[PDB]
Amino acid sequence: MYEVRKLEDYKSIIGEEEVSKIQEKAEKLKGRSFVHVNSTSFGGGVAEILHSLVPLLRSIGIEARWFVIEGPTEFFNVTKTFHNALQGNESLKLTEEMKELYLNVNRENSKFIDLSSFDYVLVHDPQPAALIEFYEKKSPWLWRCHIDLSSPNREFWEFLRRFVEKYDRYIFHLPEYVQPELDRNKAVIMPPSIDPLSEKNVELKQTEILRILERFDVDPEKPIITQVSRFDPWKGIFDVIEIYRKVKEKIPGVQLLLVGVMAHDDPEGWIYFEKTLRKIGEDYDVKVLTNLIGVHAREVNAFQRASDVILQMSIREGFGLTVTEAMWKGKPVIGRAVGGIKFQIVDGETGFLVRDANEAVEVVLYLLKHPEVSKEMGAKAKERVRKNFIITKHMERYLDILNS
Numbered sequence: 001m002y003e004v005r006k007l008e009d010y011k012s013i014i015g016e017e018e019v020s021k022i023q024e025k026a027e028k029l030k031g032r033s034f035v036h037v038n039s040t041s042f043g044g045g046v047a048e049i050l051h052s053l054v055p056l057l058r059s060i061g062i063e064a065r066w067f068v069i070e071g072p073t074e075f076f077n078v079t080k081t082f083h084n085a086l087q088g089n090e091s092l093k094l095t096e097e098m099k100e101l102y103l104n105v106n107r108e109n110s111k112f113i114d115l116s117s118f119d120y121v122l123v124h125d126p127q128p129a130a131l132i133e134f135y136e137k138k139s140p141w142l143w144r145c146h147i148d149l150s151s152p153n154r155e156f157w158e159f160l161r162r163f164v165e166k167y168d169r170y171i172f173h174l175p176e177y178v179q180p181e182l183d184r185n186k187a188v189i190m191p192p193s194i195d196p197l198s199e200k201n202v203e204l205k206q207t208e209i210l211r212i213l214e215r216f217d218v219d220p221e222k223p224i225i226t227q228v229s230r231f232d233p234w235k236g237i238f239d240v241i242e243i244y245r246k247v248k249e250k251i252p253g254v255q256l257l258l259v260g261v262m263a264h265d266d267p268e269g270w271i272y273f274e275k276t277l278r279k280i281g282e283d284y285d286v287k288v289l290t291n292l293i294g295v296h297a298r299e300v301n302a303f304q305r306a307s308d309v310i311l312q313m314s315i316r317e318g319f320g321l322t323v324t325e326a327m328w329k330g331k332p333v334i335g336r337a338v339g340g341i342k343f344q345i346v347d348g349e350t351g352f353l354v355r356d357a358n359e360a361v362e363v364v365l366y367l368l369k370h371p372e373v374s375k376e377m378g379a380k381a382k383e384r385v386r387k388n389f390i391i392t393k394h395m396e397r398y399l400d401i402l403n404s
């Protein structure tokens with residue numbers, strides 16, 4: 001089990017005042033220990049966030065540290081399974097045999113750094129949940145969940161809760177994710193946040209954007225609508241296409257950017273990707289952008305910045321960070337009222353919430369012809385993210401929680 005961006009760096013974004021409350025709350029906690037544990041050290045989400053959250057924490061005077069459990073492919077393929085199991089997949093089976101490996105690997109990484117010594121402990125997701133077993137609780141232990149436990153594979157959940165039920169707090173992205181069994185009192189809701197200074201969100205130079213745009217045959221002189229999302233059947237990809245076609249009936253130069261990045265191990269994803277290209281046919285005003293052809297965080301960043309309107313027609317959505325990112329870039333978003341999309345968007349305020357494609361077409365048409373209102377909604381949507389979902393307000397939320 002191995003180990004391992006200041007606050008002032010965001011001053012110009014949040015203003016001294018907000019910077020105060022942070023430094024303020026960070027005092028009645030100064031010096032204490034804030035440990036983080038997880039599986040990977042290289043990646044997005046948890047990894048990417050910690051890489052910034054850790055240093056950022058120290059900056060406010062907090063002995064925060066980050067350790068990473070380690071194990072063989074087996075241990076991960078097992079956890080890979082738990083992941084989906086805990087995500088409703090009833091066809092998965094948990095065998096005592098694999099049930100040991102999990103506990104054993106927890107035992108190996110446990111036999112080392114005395115995680116029980118630190119003032120505060122926080123474990124991210126399943127893989128290291130069992131750690132709270134191999135130590136004697138002295139300090140509070142928090143469990144941060146990133147997946148959805150509203151309806152997990154029972155034989156799997158019942159095994160995990162034996163561990164989770166111990167922690168002093170359970171942190172979920174949103175309500176429709178909390179485990180109903182658990183005590184609504186030791187549970188806390190904390191949405192994932194975007195780092196304004198990350199590659200995906202920092203402001204690129206016009207020149208650089210134009211380069212990326214040309215490199216992918218995207219014309220910035222013609223209108224652009226975009227939906228960045230993983231390729232799967234419940235993301236409204238086919239509806240966005242229909243919206244594009246409809247809208248195109250009146251705005252012939254309108255371009256559609258279907259942006260998405262997915263792991264190699266995502267057969268379904270790539271399958272849906274191919275079905276999309278087949279559905280699109282030879283209409284090349286529709287761009288299908290993915291890491292298959294070089295689209296990464298910097299390019300995703302660009303595609304969003306160059307967008308005039310951004311859509312999110314998810315049927316099944318989690319917190320939806322994509323909407324958050326678009327909002328941060330001053331873009332009006334049009335989506336379906338689900339998961340984090342309904343929470344994040346303030347209808348008619350920051351963007352619009354619709355129930356079908358036709359409503360979506362009306363709004364895109366509206367927004368395309370009324371740029372002032374778009375600029376309007378976008379600036380407000382940006383303030384909503386500034387005041388609600390940036391990595392600093394996220395950190396501030398960890399303070400409160402710890403204070404209590």
